Amino acid sequence: MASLTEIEHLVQSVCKSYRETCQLRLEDLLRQRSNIFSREEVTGYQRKSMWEMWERCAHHLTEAIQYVVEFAKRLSGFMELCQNDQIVLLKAGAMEVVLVRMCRAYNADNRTVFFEGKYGGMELFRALGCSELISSIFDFSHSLSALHFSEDEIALYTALVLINAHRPGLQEKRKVEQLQYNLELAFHHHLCKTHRQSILAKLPPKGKLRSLCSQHVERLQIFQHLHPIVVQAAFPPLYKELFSKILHRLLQE
Ligand SMILES: O=C(O)[C@H]1CC[C@H](C(=O)N2CC[C@@]3(S(=O)(=O)c4ccc(F)cc4)c4ccc(OCc5c(F)cccc5Cl)cc4CC[C@@H]23)CC1
């Protein structure tokens, strides 16, 4: 049950929820493309301490995940599932949603990402000691650039990243399956109607997004083992919660 109106109405409320919950405006990100970090500024970032860079990136990651919580809270029928399923979906999905959202701050053209006010390439994150991880993040953004996503496509796709009935630990598995289906119908209908069905074959596999979150938790478990007090005192609580009950607080406001 759902007609060609109830499926279409979902499309526009998904695009709306997404529009209203992005950390950065795409128009803004596009106009700052020529504001690039100097050779001296890149060298300043490389000279910064690993733990300083870690705290900066973790703070920025937390900043973005907070907007993913607001996207989830406005997503049709997400607030109607149980609190345990809301956390299950956000714990597993929020990072992946930022991993897709991230492509809007990318520029395949110059291979740079927007960070702390200006655009900069992979070598801006050398201090982190995440040679392969930052590389994967950059390649993942490069691959999504090739798809030339519309904002409405990013909205429907990210909503499907978050609404995954296959996430382990889901209590009302069928209530999440029912929701995932309507969003899939809304996405594929919008792709059909816009003559953009050809993207389906080119969307990244399920494992591309899964290995990225896993690599993040692996390098984090390494950094935390060498600087445990740095993570306790300077890392954000919601960051430590997601990768190391703030989510329950966010889910009420
Ligand atoms: O408008 C929006 O909502 C979007 C605006 C743009 C936002 C965005 O680009 N981002 C939100 C924060 C940022 S970043 O700008 O700090 C950045 C960092 C590394 C990059 F390769 C590129 C960018 C980020 C932060 C941490 C991270 O992994 C976890 C992590 C740590 F935490 C700490 C150390 C190491 C790691 Cl690996 C990965 C990414 C990728 C997406 C990036 C995404 C949301």
Short mmCIF file of C-alpha atoms and ligand atoms in Angstrom, two decimals:
data_model
loop_
_atom_site.label_atom_id
_atom_site.label_comp_id
_atom_site.label_asym_id
_atom_site.label_seq_id
_atom_site.Cartn_x
_atom_site.Cartn_y
_atom_site.Cartn_z
CA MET A 1 0.00 0.00 0.00
CA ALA A 2 1.17 3.48 -1.32
CA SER A 3 -0.10 5.24 -4.53
CA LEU A 4 1.87 7.36 -7.09
CA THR A 5 0.92 10.42 -4.85
CA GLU A 6 1.91 9.00 -1.47
CA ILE A 7 5.28 7.88 -3.06
CA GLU A 8 5.79 11.32 -4.74
CA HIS A 9 4.83 13.25 -1.52
CA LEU A 10 7.48 11.25 0.36
CA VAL A 11 10.11 12.35 -2.31
CA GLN A 12 9.43 16.02 -1.58
CA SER A 13 9.36 15.70 2.20
CA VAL A 14 12.65 13.67 2.04
CA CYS A 15 14.24 16.37 -0.15
CA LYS A 16 12.90 19.04 2.26
CA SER A 17 14.20 17.28 5.43
CA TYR A 18 17.61 16.97 3.73
CA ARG A 19 17.64 20.65 2.52
CA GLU A 20 16.87 21.90 6.06
CA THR A 21 19.48 19.70 7.80
CA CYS A 22 22.77 20.16 5.92
CA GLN A 23 25.70 21.61 7.93
CA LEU A 24 26.88 23.65 4.89
CA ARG A 25 25.00 25.25 1.96
CA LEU A 26 26.06 23.84 -1.50
CA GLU A 27 26.00 27.39 -3.04
CA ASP A 28 28.45 28.50 -0.32
CA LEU A 29 30.73 25.45 -0.82
CA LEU A 30 30.77 26.10 -4.57
CA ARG A 31 31.62 29.83 -4.31
CA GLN A 32 34.61 29.13 -1.98
CA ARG A 33 36.16 26.62 -4.50
CA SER A 34 38.90 29.10 -5.57
CA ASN A 35 39.77 30.02 -1.92
CA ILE A 36 42.56 27.40 -1.65
CA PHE A 37 45.03 26.71 1.18
CA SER A 38 48.57 28.09 0.47
CA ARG A 39 51.81 25.97 0.38
CA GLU A 40 52.68 27.61 3.80
CA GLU A 41 49.27 26.83 5.30
CA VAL A 42 49.43 23.18 4.14
CA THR A 43 52.93 22.94 5.73
CA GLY A 44 51.45 24.48 8.93
CA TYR A 45 48.85 21.70 9.07
CA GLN A 46 51.46 18.97 8.50
CA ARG A 47 53.63 20.44 11.31
CA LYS A 48 50.66 20.28 13.74
CA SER A 49 50.58 17.40 16.25
CA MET A 50 48.76 14.14 15.41
CA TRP A 51 46.52 14.48 18.47
CA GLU A 52 45.72 18.13 17.55
CA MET A 53 44.65 17.09 14.05
CA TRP A 54 42.68 14.15 15.49
CA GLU A 55 40.72 16.40 17.88
CA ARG A 56 40.07 18.94 15.05
CA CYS A 57 38.74 16.28 12.66
CA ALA A 58 36.74 14.52 15.40
CA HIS A 59 35.18 17.90 16.37
CA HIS A 60 34.27 18.61 12.73
CA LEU A 61 32.89 15.01 12.38
CA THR A 62 30.72 15.49 15.51
CA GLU A 63 29.53 18.90 14.12
CA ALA A 64 28.30 17.07 10.90
CA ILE A 65 26.77 14.02 12.70
CA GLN A 66 24.64 16.44 14.75
CA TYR A 67 22.95 17.61 11.47
CA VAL A 68 22.50 13.91 10.44
CA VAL A 69 20.57 13.45 13.75
CA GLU A 70 18.27 16.40 12.73
CA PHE A 71 17.90 14.86 9.22
CA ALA A 72 16.86 11.55 10.88
CA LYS A 73 14.48 13.32 13.28
CA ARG A 74 12.69 14.99 10.34
CA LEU A 75 12.72 11.85 8.15
CA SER A 76 9.12 10.65 7.67
CA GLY A 77 8.41 7.79 10.09
CA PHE A 78 11.87 7.64 11.75
CA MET A 79 10.59 9.19 14.98
CA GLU A 80 7.75 6.60 15.01
CA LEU A 81 10.13 3.55 15.38
CA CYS A 82 11.40 2.61 18.91
CA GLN A 83 14.23 4.53 20.65
CA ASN A 84 16.45 1.41 20.55
CA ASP A 85 15.98 1.20 16.71
CA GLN A 86 16.58 4.96 16.34
CA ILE A 87 19.97 4.55 18.07
CA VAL A 88 20.75 1.33 16.16
CA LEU A 89 20.12 3.13 12.87
CA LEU A 90 22.05 6.29 13.85
CA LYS A 91 25.04 4.48 15.44
CA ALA A 92 25.56 2.45 12.26
CA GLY A 93 24.26 4.99 9.73
CA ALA A 94 25.23 8.57 10.79
CA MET A 95 28.91 8.21 9.72
CA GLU A 96 27.87 6.73 6.34
CA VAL A 97 25.42 9.63 5.85
CA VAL A 98 28.32 12.10 6.52
CA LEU A 99 30.49 9.90 4.17
CA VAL A 100 27.97 10.63 1.35
CA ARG A 101 27.22 14.30 2.37
CA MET A 102 31.03 14.85 2.33
CA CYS A 103 31.12 14.69 -1.54
CA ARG A 104 29.47 18.17 -1.64
CA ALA A 105 32.59 19.66 0.04
CA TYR A 106 34.80 17.84 -2.58
CA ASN A 107 36.18 19.23 -5.89
CA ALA A 108 37.27 16.32 -8.26
CA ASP A 109 38.64 19.08 -10.56
CA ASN A 110 41.51 20.07 -8.10
CA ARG A 111 41.19 16.89 -5.86
CA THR A 112 40.61 19.09 -2.75
CA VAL A 113 38.11 19.01 0.10
CA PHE A 114 36.71 21.99 2.08
CA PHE A 115 38.21 22.07 5.59
CA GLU A 116 38.39 24.92 8.14
CA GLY A 117 37.53 27.66 5.64
CA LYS A 118 39.45 26.76 2.45
CA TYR A 119 40.00 23.82 0.05
CA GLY A 120 42.96 21.43 0.50
CA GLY A 121 44.21 18.09 -0.83
CA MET A 122 45.06 14.77 0.90
CA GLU A 123 48.49 16.03 2.11
CA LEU A 124 46.69 18.53 4.43
CA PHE A 125 45.82 15.51 6.69
CA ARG A 126 49.34 13.96 6.83
CA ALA A 127 49.77 14.63 10.58
CA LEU A 128 46.86 12.25 11.35
CA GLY A 129 48.93 9.22 10.32
CA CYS A 130 45.89 7.87 8.37
CA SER A 131 47.57 7.52 4.96
CA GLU A 132 45.15 4.84 3.66
CA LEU A 133 42.04 6.12 5.47
CA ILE A 134 42.12 9.76 4.22
CA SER A 135 42.98 8.26 0.77
CA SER A 136 39.77 6.10 0.84
CA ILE A 137 37.66 9.09 1.97
CA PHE A 138 39.05 11.11 -0.98
CA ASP A 139 38.50 8.21 -3.50
CA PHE A 140 34.96 7.72 -2.16
CA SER A 141 34.22 11.39 -2.76
CA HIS A 142 35.85 11.17 -6.21
CA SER A 143 33.56 8.28 -7.15
CA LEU A 144 30.40 10.19 -6.06
CA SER A 145 31.52 13.25 -8.10
CA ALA A 146 31.49 11.04 -11.24
CA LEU A 147 27.75 10.37 -10.63
CA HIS A 148 26.98 14.16 -10.83
CA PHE A 149 24.34 13.79 -8.07
CA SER A 150 21.54 16.26 -7.74
CA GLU A 151 20.71 17.48 -4.22
CA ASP A 152 17.37 15.64 -4.45
CA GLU A 153 19.33 12.42 -5.36
CA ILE A 154 21.67 12.87 -2.38
CA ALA A 155 18.58 13.36 -0.20
CA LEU A 156 16.82 10.14 -1.35
CA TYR A 157 20.06 8.09 -1.29
CA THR A 158 21.23 9.29 2.16
CA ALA A 159 17.74 8.59 3.60
CA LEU A 160 18.19 5.00 2.31
CA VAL A 161 21.69 4.83 3.90
CA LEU A 162 20.07 5.67 7.28
CA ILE A 163 16.91 3.55 6.89
CA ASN A 164 18.52 0.04 6.64
CA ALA A 165 16.31 -2.86 7.90
CA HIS A 166 19.36 -5.16 7.86
CA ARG A 167 21.16 -3.40 10.73
CA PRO A 168 21.81 -5.88 13.59
CA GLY A 169 20.02 -5.25 16.88
CA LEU A 170 16.80 -3.91 15.39
CA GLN A 171 13.79 -4.87 17.51
CA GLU A 172 10.89 -4.02 15.12
CA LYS A 173 12.73 -5.32 12.01
CA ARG A 174 9.55 -5.32 9.93
CA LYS A 175 8.60 -1.72 10.87
CA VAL A 176 12.05 -0.63 9.53
CA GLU A 177 11.66 -2.89 6.45
CA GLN A 178 8.30 -1.20 5.67
CA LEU A 179 9.97 2.24 5.91
CA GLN A 180 13.05 1.29 3.80
CA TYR A 181 10.71 0.02 1.02
CA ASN A 182 8.74 3.30 0.72
CA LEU A 183 12.02 5.29 0.52
CA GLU A 184 13.40 2.85 -2.07
CA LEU A 185 10.17 3.31 -4.10
CA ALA A 186 10.53 7.12 -3.74
CA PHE A 187 14.17 7.00 -4.84
CA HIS A 188 13.69 4.66 -7.82
CA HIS A 189 10.53 6.54 -8.89
CA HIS A 190 12.38 9.87 -8.82
CA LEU A 191 15.27 8.29 -10.79
CA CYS A 192 12.83 6.85 -13.33
CA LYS A 193 10.90 10.14 -13.74
CA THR A 194 14.10 12.26 -14.03
CA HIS A 195 15.61 9.76 -16.59
CA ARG A 196 18.47 9.09 -14.15
CA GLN A 197 17.97 5.31 -13.60
CA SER A 198 21.45 4.69 -15.12
CA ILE A 199 23.01 5.82 -11.78
CA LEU A 200 21.75 2.67 -10.00
CA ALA A 201 24.44 0.47 -11.58
CA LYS A 202 27.17 3.04 -10.70
CA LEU A 203 26.22 3.59 -6.96
CA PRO A 204 29.00 2.40 -4.62
CA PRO A 205 28.60 -1.16 -3.27
CA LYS A 206 27.36 -1.75 0.34
CA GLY A 207 30.89 -2.74 1.46
CA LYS A 208 32.54 0.50 0.28
CA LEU A 209 30.73 2.47 3.02
CA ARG A 210 31.07 -0.35 5.56
CA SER A 211 34.89 -0.70 5.19
CA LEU A 212 35.29 3.08 5.63
CA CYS A 213 33.57 3.17 9.01
CA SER A 214 35.56 0.06 9.99
CA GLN A 215 38.87 1.64 8.96
CA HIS A 216 37.94 4.72 11.02
CA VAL A 217 37.24 2.58 14.15
CA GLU A 218 40.48 0.58 13.54
CA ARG A 219 42.76 3.70 13.33
CA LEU A 220 40.82 5.22 16.25
CA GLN A 221 41.43 2.13 18.41
CA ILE A 222 45.19 2.61 17.55
CA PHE A 223 45.27 6.36 18.42
CA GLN A 224 43.27 5.80 21.64
CA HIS A 225 45.70 3.05 22.71
CA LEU A 226 48.63 5.52 22.41
CA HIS A 227 46.84 8.67 23.74
CA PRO A 228 44.00 7.50 26.09
CA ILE A 229 43.92 10.71 28.13
CA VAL A 230 43.79 12.80 24.90
CA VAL A 231 40.58 10.96 23.90
CA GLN A 232 38.99 11.21 27.41
CA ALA A 233 39.61 14.92 27.87
CA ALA A 234 39.68 16.51 24.41
CA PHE A 235 37.48 14.25 22.18
CA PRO A 236 33.76 15.08 21.89
CA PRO A 237 31.41 12.86 23.95
CA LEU A 238 29.09 12.02 21.02
CA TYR A 239 32.24 11.06 18.95
CA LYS A 240 33.44 8.67 21.71
CA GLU A 241 29.87 7.33 21.99
CA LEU A 242 29.65 6.56 18.27
CA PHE A 243 33.14 5.12 17.63
CA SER A 244 35.10 4.49 20.89
CA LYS A 245 23.92 8.16 26.09
CA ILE A 246 24.24 11.60 24.20
CA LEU A 247 22.18 10.16 21.30
CA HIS A 248 19.13 9.67 23.57
CA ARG A 249 19.38 13.36 24.60
CA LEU A 250 19.58 14.52 20.94
CA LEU A 251 16.58 12.30 20.05
CA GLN A 252 14.25 14.16 22.46
CA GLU A 253 15.00 17.87 21.74
O1 LIG B 1 26.84 19.97 4.67
C1 LIG B 1 27.10 18.85 5.31
O2 LIG B 1 26.34 18.34 6.12
C2 LIG B 1 28.45 18.26 4.97
C3 LIG B 1 29.53 19.36 4.90
C4 LIG B 1 30.93 18.77 4.69
C5 LIG B 1 31.27 17.76 5.79
C6 LIG B 1 32.67 17.18 5.59
O3 LIG B 1 33.27 17.33 4.53
N1 LIG B 1 33.26 16.55 6.63
C7 LIG B 1 32.80 16.47 8.02
C8 LIG B 1 34.11 16.39 8.81
C9 LIG B 1 35.16 15.76 7.85
S1 LIG B 1 36.66 16.80 7.76
O4 LIG B 1 36.31 18.00 7.04
O5 LIG B 1 37.19 16.92 9.09
C10 LIG B 1 37.83 15.91 6.77
C11 LIG B 1 38.69 15.02 7.38
C12 LIG B 1 39.40 14.12 6.60
C13 LIG B 1 39.23 14.18 5.24
F1 LIG B 1 39.82 13.22 4.49
C14 LIG B 1 38.45 15.10 4.62
C15 LIG B 1 37.73 15.99 5.40
C16 LIG B 1 35.55 14.39 8.42
C17 LIG B 1 35.92 14.25 9.75
C18 LIG B 1 36.35 13.04 10.26
C19 LIG B 1 36.43 11.94 9.42
O6 LIG B 1 36.75 10.67 9.81
C20 LIG B 1 36.89 10.39 11.21
C21 LIG B 1 38.25 10.86 11.66
C22 LIG B 1 38.38 11.63 12.80
F2 LIG B 1 37.25 11.99 13.45
C23 LIG B 1 39.58 12.01 13.35
C24 LIG B 1 40.74 11.61 12.73
C25 LIG B 1 40.69 10.82 11.60
C26 LIG B 1 39.47 10.46 11.07
CL1 LIG B 1 39.50 9.42 9.70
C27 LIG B 1 36.07 12.06 8.09
C28 LIG B 1 35.60 13.27 7.59
C29 LIG B 1 35.12 13.35 6.16
C30 LIG B 1 33.95 14.30 6.00
C31 LIG B 1 34.43 15.69 6.43
C32 LIG B 1 30.23 16.65 5.77
C33 LIG B 1 28.84 17.22 6.03
#
